[PDB]
């Protein structure tokens, strides 16, 4: 049942589900646009300490090691001390920002400070300036933040207040306070700034501050640590970190590790292969990880992205917090951060350090080669394990700032790029995250990399970025970029998928950037496009055509070059592609070609005229995308041809006449949107898209697993149960047939019709009673008889419904409703009609009423009969029509085809049925003339039985059955006498005739007629599977007759 009932039978408007997705997408927040670029320019080194002078505030002890900058020459005397310490602070600050302007001041007083601040302001006024106070060897600051200058005499003190410095330091600035009670200074500074801002109402928000510890506590004295512990932590993190690590571990699990080895570690701290550089590399990764994972976005960008020096200082500040906590000191800063020293990531740091030190013996000692750490490999492993389920409704990975910096090396770069690509399958969500974290300028720099093996990854990455960040204003194009992708597409050996992605990238570059529309001409993209038209890949041909069109847009020279290489003719040869999408691309490109002709005329107007004709023939196409893009392209043509339609429009109200015919045919098409747009174009002239979908495709996830490949999917179960229902309904009908059939003396259905039951049709399963009036299709529930809603067909006043059919015998078919004027209105939404009456579409079947017969197992649809000919539409490809010129002389009939062969039957004409096999040549159309019905024939049809006789009805009522191979061999019954129609049921011994009076007549194949069944007649309809007869009476009721 369901094993075979689930046929491989697609619906003719299945592709509509994809074709009507004419939509765009959304943009991004684009927080990466760091419009604030305020850099730091200069630094001031205020070394207020006086060597050898012990303030009264302090009482030292024997282990007061007073190292500052790791250098304690109290032996050498004061002058050497000051010189050396100043030089070392210079050298240390240069390690983080060499390019600044450094000014030193050792034991300043007042005018020195004023002059220094004035010079700093003169040098720059918007760029930040760094300032820091030492602040050792001076008394403790007051409640006013007063700071004791000395006049080369410790008794000659001057307490400079905060206000003088604020006045002197007006520009943006960073302050660092290595005092004892520095938090007091920060607090008083903020109060003073509030007072200054209040006076300005009669500088805040332009000031960063870092403080050693809280106002109510003093710096500690430790025998082993430097006195300038906070400064060293902010300035030289590695040395103090390792030294603290060796001093602080409660139980040492690595014997042999000692400070002598720590003071001899080989490296540079700027070479990732060396030990110390690797240790910096790990340190930087970990600290950025914590900072990104604990803060909100804006604070993160302000502290870690606007400026290099600020980012470095806060990166070290986190370590400063960790170390200071163990000695009862809480560092203090401008805008406060959450507490961070419980974060799990710190454990990783410790482990990493151990591993390096675990091999530091026997490297220094014996020269054994250094081994590299497994840290980044493990982090990549964790990121991959998160990807393997990759749900987006939860937290993002914690390791993303780590892979960002793994990209910057040249060891793991391929694997990181692969994992980033997988992360960017994926949705706009992942794109937004990976954009916000950064990454993209580094990829822009990788575009210039010489490694061609990086090509397929980068393309794919960019293929997603531009797919989401469509508004990107081509920073890649500025640094070549477009040329790189031109060379990429120039490769024929690259896979067709990557060629298609590169074509899309070039298309977006040309679309979204005018200098891109120039660079495409600079590199000769038109020739490459015309070369790439020779590929079976559909999307590649579409993007080739779209690139050509966009190139031709807004440049006359491009249009001239397209003429020069006969680009338009090669594009015209693309119109032989069965795929509607590629032909839409060709239509768009040709319309743009003519539109950008600029009305230069010369000889090329002929070419333009040809291009109009090149599209005109496509009115014969029934494909909806093609029709819509044809009316759009015709708008792109008439934008120029309206210069001369001012005269020609009177014909509608050579080339121009054919354009009027084209636009009127598109107006006459039953499809609503095509007709409406064509009428708009016609009105606009007379008074005087797919590209979005194609770009939308790439941003969708790739490597999707269909829902129907999930075995436990609800779709599979629902389909199986529906097909079992349909199969069992058909099996019940088969049981009725096999058990024997009596006269249909029982009733199933009897209900009012609001109007004429002109046509009656049903399903080959649970047969929802569909009946057509002149201008509507009304439905009734068959098993119960409940009346349902109706679809109003919008038919003209001179138009009836002449036939109906379905597009599937097993699945959710779309009911076709064929009307007098050649139109067919289509919808599957009769299913759950009470809930979803939204009909689908309409189209033109014709160009005896109208009748349609769908060939279910071939994908064709045969159409009749207002024309004298037979029209064979194909719906599984380019929606064209084959015109078969039969020998009929008038409107022909309801056609039928015995699917075993290409046999067609036709005729209501001059006394003959015309039957022919289409395999013969379709210019003779040899037809078996069945002349026994010399009268006006009625309802020529085939038996679907193996016997295959020809059924015939006369206008006079004669009913006859011809042998297909012998017109002379016939069986004659002549049953329709006082009766209105005929309807044989080939699966049963039942043939209905209706009546002219208030009854119904049925007869068996032997001719045995009854005329007394009551449960004139417009319509008779046997169910396609049940041996039950439906009577669409002329009293505007409907009734179903059943076997007893």
């Amino acid at each position: 049942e369901a094993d075979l009932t689930d046929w491989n039978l697609p619906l003719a408007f299945m592709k509509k589900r994809h074709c009507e997705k004419i939509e765009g997408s959304k943009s991004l927040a684009q927080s990466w646009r760091m419009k604030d670029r305020m850099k730091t320019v200069s630094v001031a080194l205020v070394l207020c300490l006086n060597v050898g002078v012990d303030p009264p505030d302090v009482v030292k002890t024997t282990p007061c090691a007073r190292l500052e900058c790791w250098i304690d020459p109290l032996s050498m005397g004061p002058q050497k001390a000051l010189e050396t310490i100043g030089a070392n602070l210079q050298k240390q600050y240069e390690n983080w920002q060499p390019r600044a302007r450094y000014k030193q001041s050792l034991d300043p007083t007042v005018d020195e400070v004023k002059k220094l601040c004035t010079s700093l302001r003169r040098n720059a006024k918007e760029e930040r300036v760094l300032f820091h106070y030492n602040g050792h060897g001076v008394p403790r600051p007051t409640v006013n933040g007063e700071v004791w200058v000395f006049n080369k005499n410790y008794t000659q003190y001057i307490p400079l207040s905060i206000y003088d410095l604020q006045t002197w330091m007006g520009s943006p600035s960073i302050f660092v306070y290595d005092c004892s009670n520095a938090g007091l200074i920060v607090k008083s500074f903020k109060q003073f700034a509030l007072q200054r801002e209040q006076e300005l109402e009669v500088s805040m928000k332009n000031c960063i501050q870092l403080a050693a510890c809280e106002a109510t506590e003093l710096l500690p004295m430790i025998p082993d640590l430097p006195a300038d512990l906070f400064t060293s932590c902010l300035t030289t993190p590695i040395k103090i970190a390792l030294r603290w690590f060796c001093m602080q571990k409660c139980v040492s699990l690595v014997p042999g590790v000692t400070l002598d080895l720590i003071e001899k570690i080989p490296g540079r701290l700027n070479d990732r292969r060396t030990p110390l550089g690797e240790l910096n590399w790990i340190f930087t990764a970990i600290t950025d990880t914590i900072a990104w994972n604990v803060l909100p976005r804006d604070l993160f960008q302000k502290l870690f992205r606007q400026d290099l020096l600020v980012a470095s200082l806060f990166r070290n500040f986190l370590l400063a917090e960790r170390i200071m906590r163990s000695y009862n000191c809480t560092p203090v800063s401008s805008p406060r951060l959450p507490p961070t020293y419980m974060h799990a990531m710190w454990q990783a740091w410790d482990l990493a350090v151990d591993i390096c030190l675990s091999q530091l013996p026997t490297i220094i000692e014996e020269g054994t080669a250094f081994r590299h750490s497994p840290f980044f490999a493990e982090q990549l492993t964790a990121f991959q394990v998160w990807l393997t389920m990759g749900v987006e409704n939860r937290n993002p990975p914690e390791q993303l700032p780590i892979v960002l910096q793994v990209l910057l090396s040249q060891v793991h770069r391929l694997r990181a790029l692969d994992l980033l690509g997988r992360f960017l399958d994926l949705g706009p969500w992942a794109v937004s995250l990976a954009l916000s974290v950064g990454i993209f300028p580094y990829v822009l720099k990788l575009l210039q990399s010489s490694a061609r093996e990086l090509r397929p990854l980068l393309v794919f990455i960019w293929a997603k970025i531009l797919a989401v960040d469509s508004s990107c204003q081509a920073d890649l194009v500025k640094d070549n970029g477009h040329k790189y992708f031109l060379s990429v597409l120039a490769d024929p050996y690259m896979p067709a998928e990557h060629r298609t992605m590169t074509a899309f990238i070039l298309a977006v570059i040309v679309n979204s950037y005018h200098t891109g529309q120039e660079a495409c001409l600079q590199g000769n993209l038109i020739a490459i496009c015309l070369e790439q038209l020779n590929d079976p890949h559909p999307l590649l041909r579409q993007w080739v055509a779209i690139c050509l069109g966009r190139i031709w847009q807004n440049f006359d020279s491009a249009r001239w070059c397209g003429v020069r290489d006969s680009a338009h003719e090669k594009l015209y040869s693309l119109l032989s592609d069965p795929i509607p999408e590629v032909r839409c691309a060709a239509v768009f490109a040709l319309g743009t070609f003519v539109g950008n002709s600029a009305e230069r005329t010369d000889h090329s107007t002929t070419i333009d005229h040809n291009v109009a004709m090149m599209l005109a023939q496509l009115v014969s196409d029934g494909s909806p995308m093609v029709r819509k893009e044809l009316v759009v392209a015709l708008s792109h043509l008439v934008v120029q041809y309206e210069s001369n339609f001012c005269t020609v429009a009177l014909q509608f109200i050579s080339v121009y006449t054919q354009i009027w015919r084209v636009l009127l045919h598109l107006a006459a098409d039953p499809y609503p949107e095509v007709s409406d747009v064509a009428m708009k174009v016609l009105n606009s002239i007379a008074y005087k898209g797919f590209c979005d979908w194609s770009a939308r495709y790439f941003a969708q996830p790739v490597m999707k697993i269909p829902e129907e490949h999930d075995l436990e999917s609800q779709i599979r179960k629902e389909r199986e149960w529906r097909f079992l229902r349909n199969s069992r309904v058909r099996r019940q009908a088969q049981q009725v047939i096999q058990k024997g059939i009596t006269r249909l003396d029982d009733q199933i259905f009897l209900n009012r019709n609001p109007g004429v039951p002109s046509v009656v049709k049903f399903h080959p399963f649970t047969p929802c009673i569909a009946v057509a009036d002149k201008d509507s299709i009304c439905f009734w529930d068959w098993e119960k008889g409940e009346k349902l809603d109706y679809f109003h067909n919008g038919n003209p006043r001179y138009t009836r419904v002449t036939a109906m059919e379905y597009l599937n015998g097993q699945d959710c078919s779309l009911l076709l409703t064929a009307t007098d004027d050649g139109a067919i209105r289509v919808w599957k939404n009769f299913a759950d009609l009470e809930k979803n009456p939204e009909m689908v579409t309409a189209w033109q079947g014709l160009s005896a009423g109208m009748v349609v017969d769908w060939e279910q197992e071939t994908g064709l649809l045969m159409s009749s009969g207002d024309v004298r000919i037979v029209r064979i539409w194909d719906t599984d490809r380019e929606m064209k029509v084959q015109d078969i010129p039969t020998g009929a002389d008038s409107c022909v009939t309801s056609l039928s085809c015995d699917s075993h062969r290409s046999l067609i039957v036709a005729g209501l004409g001059d006394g003959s049925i015309r039957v022919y096999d289409r395999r013969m040549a379709l210019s003779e159309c040899r037809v078996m003339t069945y002349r026994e019905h010399t009268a006006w024939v009625v309802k020529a049809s085939l038996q679907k039985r193996p016997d295959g006789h020809i059924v015939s009805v006369s206008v006079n009522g004669d009913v006859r059955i011809f042998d297909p191979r012998m017109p002379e061999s016939v069986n004659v019954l002549q049953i329709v006498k006082g009766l209105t129609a005929l309807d044989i049921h080939p699966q049963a011994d039942l043939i209905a005739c209706g009546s002219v009076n208030q009854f119904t007549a049925i007869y068996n194949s032997s001719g045995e007629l009854i005329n007394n069944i009551k449960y004139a007649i417009s319509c008779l309809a046997f169910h396609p599977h049940w041996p039950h007869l439906a009577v669409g009476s002329n009293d505007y009721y409907i009734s179903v007759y059943s076997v007893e």
Partner: peptide, 8 residues
Amino acid sequence: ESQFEMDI
């Protein structure tokens, strides 16, 4: 421009 000394 870059905050880090990248290897291209």
